[PDB]
Design a protein around this nucleic acid. Structure first.
Length: 1319
RNA sequence: UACCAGCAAAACACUCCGAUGUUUUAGAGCUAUGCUGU
RNA sequence: AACAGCAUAGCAAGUUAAAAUAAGGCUAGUCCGUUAUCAACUUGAAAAAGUGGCACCGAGUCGGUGCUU
DNA sequence: CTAATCGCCAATCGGAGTGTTTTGCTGGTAT
DNA sequence: ATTGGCGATTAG
């Protein structure tokens, strides 16, 4: 009767409590089912539930994409084999068969073991003549005589399998050994163009400056700093930036009226040039073309590093250079090492475990490690050119490395084209297949088509045109393209809120602009001298205003209307408008753009054919490709001319609206007979806005909208919500707990529900590296900071400041972080708030210590301030407050708003949860069609309870039990109920559903004042009661006593969720061959003992089975029962058939009645109160937890910190109570000698405590908290007392739990079933 | 509780490509001494 | 005797290529396979439905007293 | 002599495109 | 950010 519920939600737990009218927790006795002796148990109603966290769906996507790419790459080679498999049968019958059985040992091969020539003599000559494949490629490109076609196949296959990147669109030709020649040609052309203003070459090597491993902006700055008088905006700078590859704005260089920007990496450049070529061509004609050639010589500059005009194969000739320097250096190093230090020969060239040359070729060492290990040896012996090579990273190098990711596919295409044209006269079948071969290399699926499916995938949306296969030679005749792009966009755009069955208009529709104009100008309220009361304008006056103002300019200022509309046609001088803030946000811009392009107004003004305009506007905002738009615009080709068709091609919009057209010009009133547009155009003296037209009960808009809104499930809704899945898991569990609690207590509803919601190295390193690179500093490479230091705030702030003291401009010491301090820009007392803290050794340099820092720092280093802003080492809040320091100061209304915001919740997730719970709880109506409310849902904050605790001495320590979750859940409800009972005027703020600044400050700062005694000089009534009704609210002689009694109970329900594991099969590494039974085969015909495989799989659940087995040699029959694990790989076979699966293992005569399934975290109970949980088929975890009295907790909290006359009393209390540590240690020992059962660790702990025993109480009270880790719930771990480390204790047996009691629990823990395992 | 506005961030859901890394096999190893043998 | 394998001692060379990249499946496609959901028992393919008495004194993981099925 | 302990171990980098909420200073307006 | 597998030596 008249109870209430309090909840606490989090990422990994949910806490619940139920309270009565006098702040008491009830108790009840519950039934017990099973086959044991016990048949009743008494329990209280308070507790918490713990579970594991959810994850995102990012890894699955990556695996899916990788799978698809592997399949497609495998399919790519079969077409080549199909082309080649008609003449290869006349030179070697079994060439292709031998190439797939290369992985097998020489007892399952079925052919010979030389899979190129099939012989021993002519297999070594090939390797002697062609050490690599690049030798063969160069020879085939350059030679002139007939060759064996197996070699041709091998070269072509190597080219097709690995084929470079697709980052550049266009045509490319190799001529890069003339960077300075092309540079000087461009400079000469520039001088020819500007004879009045010549530019000197200055003899600067563009190769060095423009090939630095930095950003392009820095390179441009370095290049432009050499020549004085020229900046980035200069014409020469713009041209050189286009050549370097960037997006330069050309509007200012020729005072162009419209934007015109060109980039060299897009297809548009082939046509956009024509635009700039429109009103030009006598000059600025070749000055562009030459620039293009320059872009060719800079891109392919550091890649080739070989001469030209000798061979037409630069890449294959630039890798034969590597396989000469390697050979030349190895001999010299060998001779030197043998000559000078003969003792260290065997370690470098023979030992295969230490980072040598033998560990670099057939070992497991990278190149950086090899460079580090050999440098100190090289300097001791003396022979110096090798050091110079090392410092450039050009020492002994290989061919297939990690820096090959910058090779385009045009080079491979060129080499293929060269090879195919030389042999086409000896082999006529190569003459008529060249294009088919190149199409295999060049083809690529666009991103707006997707998988080529047939109706069995939930990711595909493609639409077909015929019924054939989609080989890459008929892709444009079987696949429909435009419809695919349309469906690609339309599957993920939004719907209409008012009508859930209509799509949203584009943001740039003509009707949308008409609507916003007719809306923003319907509530405009002007007052003149003649009429004291302002009135509404007439419809025709508004039409005239649109004619003379809205169709004349781009945007209208607030003063332009007043100075034009009322000046000539109205002849009035006074007008005030409030409805718009100083700037008209609504304008007809698309109308002006179209009127410019098509240059006739009769077509646009007449309204008989607006549908075509809507169609073209929708078309332009949908397709991202030029050809598709050009082909789709063809239906209306006769209405216009080709000249305007050329310009309509180059026009693109973006954005999607928020309401449909059936709502604006589709739904008509059944009484008035006008659509919304008519009302916005003509509404009489009562000119209402669309929001006001919506609210007309008399009109039929209400009926249609309500019927549409009236026209499922819980998981669907929670999934459709927005946020992280952890919060969703919490919400679902909370709902289920509430239903169970309502069921337990007699199918009655409560009165109140109170809820509250609680509160990197890679990204830190990438941010630090970016900040270093942007400023061009050298602090990132100074030291290899560990991830722990990266997480460390001191080192993070040091790195973001670059080791420079912000206030004084001097280099910070790396070892002075201890003496350094952290300063906040705005005081916490001023505004209680990583973007607000800075590092400095002295805080007095900021200026005033109790205000915003003075302007001296900014006025003296604004240059570095701007530099740090560019480098992103200073935050947006940081520089915003720095600018506000000069632009003003601080007020008190902002502080009032801030305290109101910190007292009132603002997030939307809490509101969604409250709405779900409300809609579920009270669902009854009356005759008047208003819902009867009988349950109140409240949300408060996280700071009320903390203030209550710290004021009234109810302290919390988080490293002893798991009880604080339930205690917080309990403390929420008391405070919420008391506040709502005292002040019935705060529902409109705190409850879901539906001078003065100083007064609000006082009210919201002393809302929690009626609980306390003498205040500071003013005593209070002992009984506090409601001034409206006389009901008792708070009694200070009893309520604190009952709260303290409830806060120290020994029995609280705590449960853990049981789940079945799911995910990957095993570990991902492949191991060498070994003689063991713990290796899993990769395929069915590959034996692990001869090929290697995986290890260490994961289990899903265990099974308990009792049956007969044979253990021995004489076929002795016996009985046994034990636990067997089922893995993720064979779960399916076990579920399909259990008996045969088990008989395959060895067991016989299995009784299909005693098989028991056991998931993770199953609860077993032993004789003396010990409890165990199951982690696998061979591991256990603890399941107990201990309770300490309250005085010990309070003393530990007070003695840890140990950091105004009132505080001295606690200072003396801590000293006066000295003899509590012995009691705490004895409690720990007594708990550990009954349930934990560990001996060596306990002895070590006791000995260490006895031995140390002489240090301050603060220091000995900050280590028992660490010690508490021995006695906890979950997985065992490691810890440190003072300087000694204590290792892990693990329970590796599982046989005992085979004679214990198994417990089955419900969600709330109140309903139980017990089963005895002695059957 | 919904509609314009300027921006700058953040998170979440899909599609298309590049370079490495790991496991077996093929690129005949030479000379001197001793043991086992068909 | 050769020949082959073993253990010892010396000197020579080394940079490249073919195949697999979750075992597999039927729906045979240039398609699908690591996210979200899950105590026990009765009826139901499945979804789904149902199953457990109240007050009082106390407190080392819940115990006792009075009334009912 | 066989179970129980002790110590080590765990796939990683770069690019292009589309759509949606959510903060947090803005404003208006209105409901 | 851990927490369960696996090979090699050692007590009851």
């Amino acid at each position: 009767k008249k109870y209430s519920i309090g909840l606490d939600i989090g990422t990994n737990s949910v806490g619940w409590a139920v309270i009565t009218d006098e702040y008491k927790v009830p108790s009840k006795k519950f039934k017990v089912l099973g086959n044991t002796d016990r048949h009743s148990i008494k329990k209280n109603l308070i507790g918490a539930l713990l579970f594991d966290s959810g994850e995102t769906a990012e890894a699955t996507r990556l695996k899916r994409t990788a799978r698809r790419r592997y399949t497609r790459r495998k399919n790519r080679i079969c077409y080549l084999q199909e082309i080649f498999s008609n003449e290869m049968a006349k030179v070697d019958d079994s060439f292709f068969h031998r190439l797939e059985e290369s992985f097998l040992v020489e007892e399952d091969k079925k052919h010979e073991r030389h899979p190129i020539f099939g012989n021993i003599v002519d297999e070594v000559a090939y390797h002697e003549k062609y050490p690599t494949i690049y030798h063969l490629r160069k020879k085939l490109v350059d030679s002139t005589d007939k060759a064996d076609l197996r070699l041709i196949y091998l070269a072509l296959a190597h080219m097709i399998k690995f084929r470079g990147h697709f980052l550049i669109e266009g045509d490319l030709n190799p001529d890069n050994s003339d960077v300075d020649k092309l540079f000087i040609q461009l400079v000469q052309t520039y001088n020819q163009l500007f004879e009045e203003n010549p530019i000197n070459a200055s003899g600067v090597d563009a190769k060095a400056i423009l090939s630095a491993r930095l950003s392009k902006s820095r390179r441009l700055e370095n290049l432009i700093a050499q020549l004085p008088g020229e900046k980035k905006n200069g014409l020469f700078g713009n041209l050189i930036a286009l050549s370097l590859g960037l997006t330069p704005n050309f509007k200012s260089n020729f005072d162009l009226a419209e934007d015109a920007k060109l980039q060299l990496s897009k297809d548009t450049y082939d046509d956009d040039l024509d635009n700039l070529l429109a009103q030009i061509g006598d000059q600025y004609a070749d000055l562009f073309l030459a620039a293009k050639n320059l872009s060719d010589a800079i891109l392919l500059s550091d890649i080739l590093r070989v001469n030209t005009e000798i061979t037409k194969a630069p890449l294959s000739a630039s890798m034969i250079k590597r396989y000469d320097e390697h050979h030349q250096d190895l001999t010299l190093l060998k001779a030197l090492v043998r000559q000078q230090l003969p003792e260290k020969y065997k370690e470098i060239f023979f030992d295969q475990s230490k980072n040598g040359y033998a560990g670099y070729i057939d070992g497991g060492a990278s190149q950086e490690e090899f460079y580090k290990f050999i440098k100190p040896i090289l300097e001791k012996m003396d022979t110096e050119e090798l050091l110079v090579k090392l410092n450039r990273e050009d020492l002994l190098r290989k061919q297939r490395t990690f820096d090959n990711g910058s090779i385009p596919h045009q080079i491979h295409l060129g080499e293929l084209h060269a090879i195919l044209r030389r042999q086409e006269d000896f082999y006529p079948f190569l003459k008529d297949n060249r294009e088919k071969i190149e199409k295999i290399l060049t083809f690529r699926i666009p991103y707006y088509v997707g998988p080529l499916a047939r109706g069995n995938s939930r990711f595909a949306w493609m639409t077909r045109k015929s019924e054939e296969t989609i080989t890459p030679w008929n892709f444009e005749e079987v696949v429909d393209k435009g419809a695919s792009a349309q469906s690609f966009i339309e599957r993920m755009t939004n719907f209409d809120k008012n009508l859930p069955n209509e799509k949203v208009l584009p943001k740039h529709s003509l009707l949308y602009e008409y609507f916003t104009v007719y809306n923003e100008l319907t509530k405009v309220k002007y007052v003149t001298e003649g009429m004291r009361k302002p009135a509404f304008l007439s419809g025709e006056q508004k039409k005239a205003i649109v004619d003379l103002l809205f169709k004349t300019n781009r945007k209208v200022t607030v003063k332009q209307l007043k100075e034009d509309y009322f000046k000539k046609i109205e002849c009035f001088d006074s007008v005030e408008i409030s409805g718009v803030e100083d700037r008209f946000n609504a304008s007809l811009g698309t109308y002006h753009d179209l009127l410019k392009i098509i240059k006739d107004k009769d077509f646009l003004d007449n309204e008989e054919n607006e549908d075509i305009l809507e169609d073209i506007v929708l078309t332009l905002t949908l397709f991202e490709d030029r050809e598709m738009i050009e082909e789709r615009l063809k239906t209306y080709a006769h209405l216009f001319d080709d000249k305007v068709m050329k310009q309509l091609k180059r026009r693109r919009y973006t954005g999607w609206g928020r309401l449909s057209r059936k709502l604006i010009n589709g739904i008509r009133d059944k009484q008035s007979g006008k659509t919304i547009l008519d009302f916005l155009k003509s509404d009489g003296f009562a000119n209402r806005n669309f929001m006001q037209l919506i609210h007309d009960d008399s009109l039929t808009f209400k009926e249609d909208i309500q019927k549409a809104q009236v026209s499922d499930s819980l998981h669907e809704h929670i999934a459709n919500l927005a946020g992280s899945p952890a919060i969703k898991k919490g919400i679902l569990q909370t709902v289920k707990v509430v239903d169970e609690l309502v069921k337990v207590m007699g199918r009655h509803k409560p009165e109140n529900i109170v809820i509250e919601m609680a509160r990197n190295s890679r990204e830190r390193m990438k941010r630090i590296e970016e900040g270093i690179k942007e400023l061009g500093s050298q602090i990132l490479k100074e030291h290899p900071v560990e991830n722990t230091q990266l997480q460390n705030e001191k080192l993070y702030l040091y790195y973001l400041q670059n080791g420079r003291d912000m206030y004084v401009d001097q280099e910070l010491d790396i070892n002075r972080l201890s003496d350094y301090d952290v300063d906040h820009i705005v005081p916490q007392s001023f505004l209680k708030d990583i973007d607000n803290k800075v590092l400095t050794r002295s805080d007095k340099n900021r200026g005033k210590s109790d205000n915003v820092p003075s302007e001296e720092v900014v006025k003296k280093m604004k240059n570095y301030w701007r530099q740090l802003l560019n480098a992103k080492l200073i935050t947006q809040r940081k520089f915003d407050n720095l600018t506000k320091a000069e632009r003003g100061g601080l007020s008190e209304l902002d502080k009032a708003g801030f305290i109101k915001r910190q007292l009132v919740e603002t997030r939307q997730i809490t509101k969604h949860v409250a709405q779900i719970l409300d809609s579920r709880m009270n669902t009854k109506y009356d005759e008047n069609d208003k819902l009867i409310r009988e349950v109140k849902v409240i949300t408060l904050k996280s700071k009320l309870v903390s203030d209550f605790r710290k004021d009234f001495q109810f302290y919390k320590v988080r490293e002893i039990n798991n009880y604080h979750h339930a205690h917080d859940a309990y403390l929420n409800a008391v405070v919420g109920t008391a506040l709502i009972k005292k002040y019935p005027k705060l529902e409109s703020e705190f409850v879901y559903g539906d001078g003065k600044a100083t007064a609000k400050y006082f009210f919201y700062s002393n809302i929690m004042n009626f609980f306390k005694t003498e205040i500071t000089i003013r005593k209070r009534p002992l009984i506090e009661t409601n001034g409206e009704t006389g009901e008792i609210v708070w009694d200070k002689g009893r309520d604190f006593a009952t709260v303290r009694k409830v806060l120290s109970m020994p029995q609280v329900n705590i449960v853990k969720k049981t789940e079945v594991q799911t995910g990957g099969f095993s570990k991902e590494s492949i191991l060498p061959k070994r003689n063991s039974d713990k290796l899993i085969a990769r395929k069915k015909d590959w034996d692990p003992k001869k090929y290697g495989g995986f290890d260490s799989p994961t289990v899903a659940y265990s099974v308990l089975v009792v049956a007969k087995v044979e253990k021995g040699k004489s076929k002795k029959l016996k009985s046994v029962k034990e636990l067997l694990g089922i893995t993720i790989m064979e779960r399916s076979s076990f579920e399909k058939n259990p008996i045969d699966f088990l008989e395959a293992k060895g067991y016989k005569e299995v009784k299909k009645d005693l098989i028991i399934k056991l998931p993770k975290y199953s609860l077993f109970e032993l004789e003396n109160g010990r409890k165990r949980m199951l982690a696998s088929a061979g591991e256990l975890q603890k399941g107990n937890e201990l309770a300490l009295p309250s005085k010990y907790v309070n003393f530990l909290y007070l003695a840890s910190h140990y950091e105004p006359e009132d505080n001295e009393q606690k200072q003396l209390f801590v000293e006066q109570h000295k003899h509590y540590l012995d009691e705490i240690i004895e409690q720990i020992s007594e708990f550990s000698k009954r349930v934990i059962l560990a001996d060596a660790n306990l002895d070590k702990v006791l000995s260490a405590y006895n031995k140390h025993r002489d240090k301050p109480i603060r220091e000995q009270a900050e280590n028992i908290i660490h010690l508490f880790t021995l006695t906890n719930l979950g997985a065992p771990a490691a810890f440190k007392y003072f300087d000694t480390t204590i290792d892990r204790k693990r329970y590796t047996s599982t046989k005992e739990v085979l004679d214990a009691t198994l417990i089955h629990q419900s969600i709330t823990g109140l309903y139980e079933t017990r089963i005895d395992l002695s059957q």
